[PDB]
Ligand SMILES: Nc1ncnc2c1ncn2[C@@H]1O[C@H](COP(=O)(O)OP(=O)(O)OP(=O)(O)O)[C@@H](O)[C@H]1O
Ligand SMILES: Nc1ncnc2c1ncn2[C@@H]1O[C@H](COP(=O)(O)OP(=O)(O)OP(=O)(O)O)[C@@H](O)[C@H]1O
Ligand SMILES: [Mg+2]
C-alpha cells in the first residue's frame with residue numbers, strides 16, 4: 001500500500017516532522033505540525049483540530065497519501081508535508097473545505113464522462129525587503145523575456161523550478177514578464193485537483209525561497225500602480241471518453257460544439273465568477289484598461305487578447321485560455337466555479353456571443369453597446385452582488401463556502417470604503 | 433546527429449535548465465528558460481511563446497553551449513533560436529533570419545562575407561546597486577596593471593569565451609579611463625553575430641559578479657573617447673579571397689573597390705542601423721578615434737573605411753563607423769546588401785583621401801566632394817527611410833520597427849530640458 005511506501009521514505013530521508021497542510025476559503029495555506037511518531041495516527045483515524053481557521057468547530061484532518069512529499073530544504077532532520085481533506089467528527093466530508101468543493105464538482109463532471117484539465121500561467125513579483133518587512137520595490141530592473149544581468153532573479157527562479165521538480169512537478173517554461181521584477185512560471189496541463197494542489201505548492205515554495213534570499217515573492221494582482229499586474233491565465237480543456245471534447249475535425253475552425261457551449265456558459269456567469277477568481281479589493285485595480293488584463297466580456301482567436309482566447313493548436317491540444325483570473329484566487333474554488341458554469345453551457349445548450357476579432361480598446365464606447373459587449377465588475381462589492389444572485393455557483397460551491405466568501409469580501413470592502421487614502425490628501429488638502 | 437550529441441553533453445555535465453536565447457530588433461538578448469525535460473520538445477516541434485501574436489522558437493543545434501558559471505551541481509546550457517510562424521514559415525521580423533536571408537542571396541553568387549569586429553566597452557563602478565558612468569580604473573592606451581585594474585575580469589571574460597568555442601586574437605586597455613577592447617578572429621557573418629551577442633552577455637554577467645557594470649554604450653562619458661565596433665570585412669568567392677588580385681594596382685581587386693563604393697553610397701542609411709541610439713551621434717564628433725567624414729584610405733589615415741596593409745587571405749576593409757550598441761545581425765546584413773549592390777552594378781568609389789582630413793578647412797572639403805555622416809538619429813532615420821535597397825534587404829517588418837523605435841526615442845529626447853540648458857541660461861536669463 002501507499003502508507004507502507006510513505007514509512008519507507010520516512011526512514012530513508014530521516015523525516016522527523018510532518019506538516020498536515022490544508023487551505024482556508026481564501027486560498028491561504030494552513031497546517032498542523034506533528035512529530036513523525038503521530039504519522040501512523042494521521043494516516044489512520046486522523047488528527048483533530050479547531051476548524052474556525054477554515055472560515056478565515058471540532059474537525060478531523062484526512063491526509064491524501066498521494067500528496068506525501070519531503071520538503072527539499074533540509075533542517076540532518078528532514079520535514080515532510082501532506083495535503084489533507086477536512087472531515088467532521090462523525091466521518092462525513094466538511095462541505096466548507098475548498099478542496100472537497102472542487103472534488104465534488106469534478107465527481108459531478110465525471111458522472112457525464114467529463115474531466116477538466118487546467119494549465120495555469122502563474123505571474124508574480126519579487127520585491128526587496130526593508131527592515132525585515134516586505135515592500136513593493138522591484139528587486140530587478142527587467143522587462144519582457146529579459147536575460148541576466150537585466151533579470152537579477154535567474155538564480156531564485158532556477159531554484160523554484162528545481163524544488164518543484166523534486167516534488168513530482170513538471171514545468172513547461174519560465175520567463176521575465178513586462179513589469180519591473182515580474183516573472184511567470186507556466187505549468188503543464190493536469191486534472192483540476194492536481195493542478196490546484198500544485199498552485200498552492202508553487203506559492204508556498206516561491207515565498208519560502210524568496211525569504212531565504214532576503215526577498216519577498218507576492219501573487220498580489222496589482223502591487224504597483226502604472227505597471228502590469230499579475231494574472232493567472234488558465235488554459236482549460238474538457239476530455240470526454242479519453243478524447244479532447246473540444247476538438248471536431250469536421251466543424252468550422254476545427255472547434256467542437258462543446259467548446260462554444262462551454263465558452264457560452266462561462267461567459268454567462270463570468271460577472272459572478274469574478275468574485276472567486278478576482279477575490280481581493282486590489283484585484284479590481286488590475287482589471288483596468290492599458291495592461292494585458294482583460295476588462296470587456298468577449299471571446300476570440302489568438303490574434304486578439306480578449307477575456308477567453310482560443311489558441312491555434314488543434315488535436316489533443318485544443319483549449320481555451322481564460323485570462324480574467326489573478327493568482328491571488330483560491331484555485332480549488334476558481335476551477336470549481338469555471339467547471340460548473342462551463343458544464344451548464346454544455347448541458348443547458350447556451351450559444352456564446354459573436355467572436356470579436358477587432359481590437360476592443362481601439363473601438364469607441366458608442367460601438368460596444370451596439371454589439372452587446374459587457375464589462376467585468378469594477379469593484380469587489382459589484383462582483384459579490386452578482387455572485388450573490390448566481391444560484392448555480394452558490395449551489396456548486398455550497399452555501400457554507402459561498403457565505404464565507406461573501407462575509408470575508410464584505411468585511412474587507414466595508415473597511416476599504418470608509419478609509420481616507422493618501423490620493424485624497426494629495427488631491428484636495430492644499431486647495432480646499 | 434547533432435541532437436544526439438547535445439543529449440550526451442546533458443547527462444555528462446548534468447544540465448538541468450536550458451536558455452532558448454534570441455534577440456529583438458534592437459540587439460537586446462531575450463530568452464525562455466525551460467527545464468531539461470522539455471529539451472526534446474524544443475529540438476523537435478519547438479516551444480511556443482508570445483512575440484508581442486504567438487510564435488515558435490526553433491533552436492540551432494550548432495549553438496548548444498554549457499554556461500561555464502555553474503548552477504546550484506546543477507549545470508545550465510543555452511541555445512540560440514530562430515523565430516518561426518506557427519504554420520512553418522520563418523518570421524521575416526527576426527533579426528537573425530534577416531542576416532541568414534542576405535547570406536543565402538550572397539551564397540547564390542558564390543560570395544561569403546567574413547567579419548572580425550574590434551569590440552570596445554567600458555567597465556564602470558556601481559553605487560547602491562545601480563550602475564554609474566564612473567570608470568573602475570584610471571588607465572590609458574595599452575596600459576598595464578596596477579594602472580589597469582580590470583586585468584583579472586578581462587582574463588575571466590576571455591577564458592569563459594574560449595570555453596564556448598570562441599577564438600580570440602587579443603585584448604587591451606583603450607584610450608579612455610576604464611575603457612577596454614577585445615578583438616576576436618574573423619568568421620562568417622552569422623557565427624560572428626552570434627559571438628557578438630554572447631560577448632555582451634558574458635561581459636555584463638561577469639562584471640556584475642565583481643560589483644561592476646560593463647556597457648557597450650557608444651558615448652557614456654563626455655570629453656573622453658567613445659566605444660566603437662570597427663568591423664574588419666572581406667568577401668570570399670569560391671574558397672578564395674575576392675579582394676586579392678596580384679596583378680591589379682596595390683594588390684586590391686576590382687571587387688574590393690566596388691564593395692567599398694557600394695557601402696559608401698548607402699553609408700548615411702547604414703548609420704541608422706550601425707549607430708542606432710540617440711547617444712551614438714554624441715560619439716560621431718571630431719577629436720576622437722570615431723570617423724565623421726565619408727572617406728576611404730590606406731592604413732596611414734583613420735577614415736570611415738580603412739584598407740589595412742596585409743594582403744593574401746588577410747585582404748580586408750575596416751569599416752570604423754559602427755558602435756557596439758548596434759544589432760550585429762542587422763549591421764552585417766546592411767553592409768552585405770550595400771556592398772553587394774556595389775559589386776553587382778560596378779559602382780566606382782571616390783578617390784582615397786590620403787591627406788589628413790580633420791586639419792583641412794570646410795571650403796576645401798566642399799571642393800573635393802567630401803560628405804559627412806548624419807549628425808542626429810532623426811537625420812540618419814530620414815536617410816534610411818529613403819534607401820529602398822536597404823529597406824528591401826532588411827524587410828519591411830524590421831525596417832518599420834527600427835523607424836518606430838528610433839522615432840519614439842527621438843521624440844522623447846527632443847522635448848526634454850537637459851541640465852546643460854539650466855547651467856547655461858537659468859542664472860543669466
Ligand atoms: N488540453 C489542454 N488543457 C489545458 N491546458 C493545455 C492543454 N494543452 C496545452 N495546454 C497548456 O498550454 C501550454 C502549452 O501549449 P502547447 O501548444 O505546447 O500544448 P501542449 O499540450 O503543452 O504540448 P505538449 O503535449 O508537447 O506538452 C501548456 O503549458 C499547458 O498548460
Ligand atoms: N579576410 C578577413 N576578413 C575579415 N576580417 C579579417 C580578415 N583577415 C583578418 N581579419 C580580422 O582582422 C584582425 C587582424 O587580422 P591580422 O592582421 O592579424 O591577420 P590574420 O592573422 O589573418 O587574423 P586572424 O588570425 O584573426 O585570421 C583579426 O581580428 C581578424 O578578425
Ligand atoms: Mg496569455
Ligand SMILES: [Mg+2]
Pocket residue numbers: 550662750
Ligand atoms: Mg582599428
